Amino acid sequence: MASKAVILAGGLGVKPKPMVEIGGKPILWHIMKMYSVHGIKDFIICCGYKGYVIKEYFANYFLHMSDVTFHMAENRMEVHHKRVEPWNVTLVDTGDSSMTGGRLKRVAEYVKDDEAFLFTYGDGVADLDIKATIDFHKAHGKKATLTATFPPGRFGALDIQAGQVRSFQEKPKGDGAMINGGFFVLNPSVIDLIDNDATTWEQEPLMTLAQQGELMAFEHPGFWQPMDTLRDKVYLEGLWEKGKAPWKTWE
Amino acid sequence: MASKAVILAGGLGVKPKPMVEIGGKPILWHIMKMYSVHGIKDFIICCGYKGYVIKEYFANYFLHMSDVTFHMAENRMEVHHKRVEPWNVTLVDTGDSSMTGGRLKRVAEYVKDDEAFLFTYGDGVADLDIKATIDFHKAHGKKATLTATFPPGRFGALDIQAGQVRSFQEKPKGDGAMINGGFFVLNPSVIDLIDNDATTWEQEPLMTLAQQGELMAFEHPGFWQPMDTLRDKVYLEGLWEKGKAPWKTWE
Amino acid sequence: MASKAVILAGGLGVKPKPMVEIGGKPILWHIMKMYSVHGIKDFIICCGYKGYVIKEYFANYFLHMSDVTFHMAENRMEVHHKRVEPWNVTLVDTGDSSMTGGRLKRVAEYVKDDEAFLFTYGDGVADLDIKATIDFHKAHGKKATLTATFPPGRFGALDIQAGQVRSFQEKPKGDGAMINGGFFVLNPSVIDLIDNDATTWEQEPLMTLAQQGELMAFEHPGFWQPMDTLRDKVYLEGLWEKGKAPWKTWE
C-alpha cells in the first residue's frame, strides 16, 4: 500500500526546525527512523527557507553521522561503524513562504499514484505503530486518517471544585482531549482540497474532511512529544541521554 | 486591604519578556494599566537578567512614552500630551538565576506587612476585575487565591466520536479545563513556603497550598491572553491596533 | 518668517541613518549646526524605527558631546568646555512605517501656523546659504522651493565621441543635471497634498507642485554631500578630519 512518507520542514527561521538535534542528530532523522522501523523507507522532504541545510546534510550523511578516515593518498573516505540506511530521500524545495497545505500540493507528483501515503510534521516523535495506522486507514476506507495524541502541558493545571483548587500541577502530560498529533495516512485526493501555496493544511482541507466525514482518528494514548519549546528540547534530550526514549525502538 | 502588585520579570533571554511591546508599549506597562484602573498603584518589579532595561525605561518613562521638546537653553524637557501615572514603582534586582518563588521571597520586605498583596506574571493580559478578585480573596479567608482562565490553543483541536473526527479546529480559544492564569491574591505567609532562590512558585508552594486547602480559584471565563508565541504577539498587536483590546479598559 | 526646520530621520534599519557619525557626531547634528549658523534654531525631528536612540541622545546631549566630571558628593555633573546650543528640539514619533510625506503630515501641528518652514533629509550636508533660500522662497511667492545640487558619482563617467571613449573618470563629482538636494522651504499648504502615512513626498506631492508650477529651484552649484555609502562616509570623515569640511562654517 502506502510506502512513502512526506515530511514538512519549511516555515520559520538559523536552521530549519527539523534540523534541531537530539543526541546529536536532527529530529528529522529521528522521525525517519520511526518510519523506517515500521518498514517505510521512501521519503519526501518539503523544504523551505534554509532548506539547503537539509540538502547538505543528506548529501554528507555519513560525514555528519560518523567518525571517518580520509585516506588522502587514495582519495577515499572511510566510515567507521557505518550504519547504512536503505532510504530514498527526496528533497523538494517547496517555497520559502508556502503553508503546510501548499507544501503538500507542491509534492503531489511524488505520491499522486499511490493508494495512500504518510504525511507528518518534522518536529514530533512518538512510539507510534506506523503499520497499525496504515492498516487502520485501509480498513476504515475514509479519505484520511490522523493520529490523535495527548499534548504536553503549557500551563499550570488545575483541579477545581466549589471554587477551591483541590490540586495544582505545573505543565502536566495532558489528560483530557486528544489533539492533532499529525502522523497522517492519506489518499491522494486530499490534494484536490488544496488550492495553492498559501493553503494551510490544518485549515480548509482538514476541516472539510472532518466535515465531510472523511477524517478518522487513530488514537495513540502513549508516547508523543513535539519539539516546540526548549523545555521540550531538554526533556527530549534527557530521555535520549538517559537511554529512555520511547520513540527509539530501533537497534 | 491589598494595595501592591508584585510582578515577575526575570527568567530567560535581548530584553526581558515583559519588555516586549504591544502598540509600542511594553506588555508590562499594559498589565500595570490593568491594575491601575482597578485602583492598584503600588508596584514591585522582580527583575533579573537584562533588568536594567526595565530600570532605564522607568527612569526615562516620559521620554519613552511621548513626544518631547528639549528647550535646550533652559535645560528643560517638555512632554507633549503628558499622561501622568500616579504610581510608585519599585525595581528590585531578584537574581539572574532565581525561580519564580525565589523572586517573590526576595521581595518579601515590600509586602510583608500587608493584609494581602497581588502577584502576577509579566506576560499576560485580560479584562479581569482586579477588585473582584481581592474582595473574593478577603471573603474566602484562604491563604491564597489564583485566577483560573481558558488558555490559548497550541494544537489542532479534535471532536472525536467512534474514531471519527467530527470536527477539526486549529488552535482554538480553549474550552475544557481552566488553567493557572496567574493574577494571584495572597497573604504574606505564603512566603514561608518558599525556601530559596531556586524555588519555583508553581511547584511546592502552589501544590502545597492547594493540598492544604489554602488555595482558591477565581474563575475568569472571559478575555485572558499570555504572550508566549509570536502568534500571540501578532494576535495581541492586531487587537490593540484594531481598537479591540478587551484588556484595554482605561481612557 | 520661517523659523523651524523639520528633519527626516525615519526609514530603514542598528541606529537611525541620521545618527551615523562624522567626527564623532551624528550627521543629524551637523545639519542642525548648518541651520543654526543661518539663524534657525527650532527643530522638529521626524522619528521612526530606533527613534529612541535619537531621544536618548538629546536627552543626554552634553554627556554625549563632552568630557565630564561627576561630583558625586554633590550629585552634580560638570561639563568641560561646554558649548551651549540655544535650540528647541522636538522629537516626534512619526511611525516605524511612514513614508517621507507621511512623516511631514504627522508633524503638521508644529508648523501649521508659520509663513513658511524648512524641511530636509537627515543625511545631507552642504555649504548652503540657508537664509538665501528663505529669502528666495519669499521672493518667488510659490508654494515650494527645493535646493538643486550636483550629485556624487556612483559610476564610471564617460566622454564619448564617435564610439570612442575620449576620457574615463571613476565616480566624478557630478556635472550635468542638478538633482533634488532637499533643503526645502515650504508653505504649510503643501501638507494638504499629503494623504497619509504612506505618502512619499517625492512622489505625488512633489510632482504635483512642479506640475502646478508651484515648485521653484534654488540652485546650489557648490558643496553638497549625502551620506549614502561608506565611501560617502569615509569621504566626509576625511574632510572633517583634514579640517576641510565646506559645510563646517561655524566657530
Add this chain to the structure above:
Amino acid sequence: MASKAVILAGGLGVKPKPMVEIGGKPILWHIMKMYSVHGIKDFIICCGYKGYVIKEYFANYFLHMSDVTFHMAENRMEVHHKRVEPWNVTLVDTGDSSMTGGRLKRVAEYVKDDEAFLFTYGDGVADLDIKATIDFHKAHGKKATLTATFPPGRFGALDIQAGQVRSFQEKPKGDGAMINGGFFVLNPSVIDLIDNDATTWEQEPLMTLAQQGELMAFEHPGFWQPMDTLRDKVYLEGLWEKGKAPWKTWE
C-alpha cells in the same frame, strides 16, 4: 576569437556580492547565463573574501539548483529536471584585499594567450548582445572596448527652467550621459597596464586607455541593471518574478 569571461567577485563583506540572489539564484549565475546564451562557456571567477562560498556553490551546483533524490542504498544522488550547463568554471583566489585591476592581473595566466577576452562586474545584468560587442571590438581594432549604459537613478530628477522646476521624477531610469556598464572586451596587453594587487581597474588602466585612444564604447541604450541597492534587488526580483526580466533570454 574571445571565448572566456572573467568575472569580478571579490571586494566587500556575509557572502560575496555576486552570490546575492534573484529568483533563488546568485546574480553571478544570471550573468553566466547571459554569456552562455551568447556562446561564451568558459569562465574565470576572481574570488576574494568569502570566496569559498562561491567554491561550495559550484562544487554542489545541482544540489543547489534542483530537487534531488538520494538513493542511499546505491550511494547515488538523482537530480530532478536536471539542466546541464556545459561550462568550465575556474575559481581563482585573487586576494581578500585586491582591487579590480589587481584581480585581473592575478588571472592573466588564464587569458594571456587569447586574441581577446571578456571581463565584467559580478553585479550587473542586461539584455546585451555579447556577440555583437565581440565583433565590434574585433572591428575597431583597439586594445579595449567597454559597454556604455544608462544608469539607474539614485536621486530626485529635475526639469528646471528659469529657476522653476517644470517636472520632478524620483530616481528615474537615467537619460543623459551613458556610463561604464562593464561588459568589457579586451586584448591581453591591457594587463600590462596593471601594476599590482592594489591597482583599481577603473583608475590608471582605464583612464590611460581612453587617454591613449585605446578605449572604445559599445553603446547599449537598452536594459542594464546593477544590483547595488535593496531597491535594485527588489526591482530585479520583481522583474524576474513577473516573468518580465529583459536579461533572461534563455529557454
Add this chain to the structure above:
Amino acid sequence: MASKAVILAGGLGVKPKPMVEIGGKPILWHIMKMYSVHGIKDFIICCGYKGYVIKEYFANYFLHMSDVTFHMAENRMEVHHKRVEPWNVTLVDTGDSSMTGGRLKRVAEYVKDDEAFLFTYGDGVADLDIKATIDFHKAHGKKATLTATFPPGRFGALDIQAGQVRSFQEKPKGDGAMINGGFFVLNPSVIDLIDNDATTWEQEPLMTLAQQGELMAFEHPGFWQPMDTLRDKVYLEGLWEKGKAPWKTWE
C-alpha cells in the same frame, strides 16, 4: 601629595574591558573602591571606543547599583540601601585609537599641577596598600614607581632536572620573576616622554625611565589578579561570590 587616580579604559572591542563585571559590578568600580579605601577619591577615566557606556554608567550610578523606587507622582527616584561614594569622576574621551601613553598624555591637564598622581590599568585588582606605594614613591624621589607582582600562570609549569620532569603544575600562581602589575605612582614630567596618541606607555616611556634610573619597583608579593581570560573572570567571580576576595577590603 598625590590625590588623583588615572585609569585606562580604552583599547579593544561589546563594552569596554573595565566594564566587565564581577559580582554584578564593573571591574573598574572594584579598582575605584581599592583606591577609595586608601583615601583616593579623585578619578580620571581615559575613555575610548564604547566610552559612552562608561559615561552612562556614572551618569546613572545609583540606578545601576541599587534597588529603586520611582515615586512617579512626585517625579522622584528613591534609592534603597543607598551607599554614597564621595568621588569626583572625570570621563575623558581619549581617542578610539590611542595607545596607553597617548591616553595619559591626553589627560595631562588634569594632573599637570600635582606632586604626583596614580595611574593604572582598568583590569587588575589586588590587596595593595595604595598609601604605602605613595609614601614609597615620595621617599625614593624618582620620577616613577610601578607595582611589581606575581602573574597568573598561562601554561603548564615544569620542575625539570636532568631532563626529568620532577613535577607538573597546570597554570600555577606565578613564582619567579615579578612583572608590571601597574598601579603606578608618577610625577607629571613623565608625560614629557610621551610623544603622541600612538605612544604606548610600556614602550619608550617606561623603558627610558628604567633606563634613566628613574623607575622604582614597589614589590607586592601578595594578591594581584588581572582579568584577561574567562578563566580569570570565573576565578575572580568565584572569589567574590565565596566572600573571599582579597582586594575587597572595604565595608
Add this chain to the structure above:
Amino acid sequence: MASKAVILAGGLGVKPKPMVEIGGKPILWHIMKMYSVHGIKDFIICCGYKGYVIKEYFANYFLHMSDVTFHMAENRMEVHHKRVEPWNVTLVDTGDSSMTGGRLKRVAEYVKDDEAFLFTYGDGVADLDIKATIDFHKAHGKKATLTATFPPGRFGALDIQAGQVRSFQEKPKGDGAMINGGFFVLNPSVIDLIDNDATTWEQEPLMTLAQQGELMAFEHPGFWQPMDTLRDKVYLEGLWEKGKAPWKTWE
C-alpha cells in the same frame, strides 16, 4: 615506532580553535605539516563543538586549498597546482564537553597497539625536530615525554635590583623557566591514568607521571609559538607573510 599524531581540537567556541588561519590555512594544517616533514603522516583529530567544520574541511581539502576548474560537462573538478598530501586523517567526535584527557581516552582505539604515539595541542607551532623527540622518548624508556619550551610574554617584564627597575620589556619572548609546550611522545599505558571524559590531561595524568618519575622533558630552546591571542595571531601571520616562519620547514 610511533607513527600517529593525535591532535586536540575540541573545547571552546565560531569555529574550532585549530581552524583559525595563518596564511589562509588553519593552524591545524600547519601542525600537520610539521609532523609530516618529520615523517608522521597518520593523524587522529579529536573533535568537539563545531567539529563538522573540521570534517568539511578535510572532506573538501583541495577545494579549500587551491584554485580549481569545474569541467561541468564531464562532471569533473580540476585542481591547479595540486599538492598531494599522503595522509590518513581520522576525525573522531570526542564530545562537546570532554576535557583533554577525556578526548585522548576517546581515541585510545586508534593508538592502543602502537609502541608509542604523538600527542599535541592544535594551537602551537614550532621548528621542533619531531624525529628527535621520538628517538629521545625511545631512549629514556619512560612512559612519557613532553616538549619543554619558552613561552610568549603576556606582561611587562622587569629587571629589578635594590627596588630599582634596571630594565623594562613589554611582553618579551620568555627567558626563565620552560613550560609545557605539548608535543608529547607517549606510550599507550598513559591512557590508563585517564578516568573519563572530564579528565583534564594536564591534571592528574600529567602530575602523576611526573610524580611517578614517568615523565621526561625534551627541551626545545628554539622557536615555539601558541596562538592564544590576536597579538599571537598577528605575529604568526606576519612571520608567515614575511617568509620568515621558523616552523615552515617544508618545500
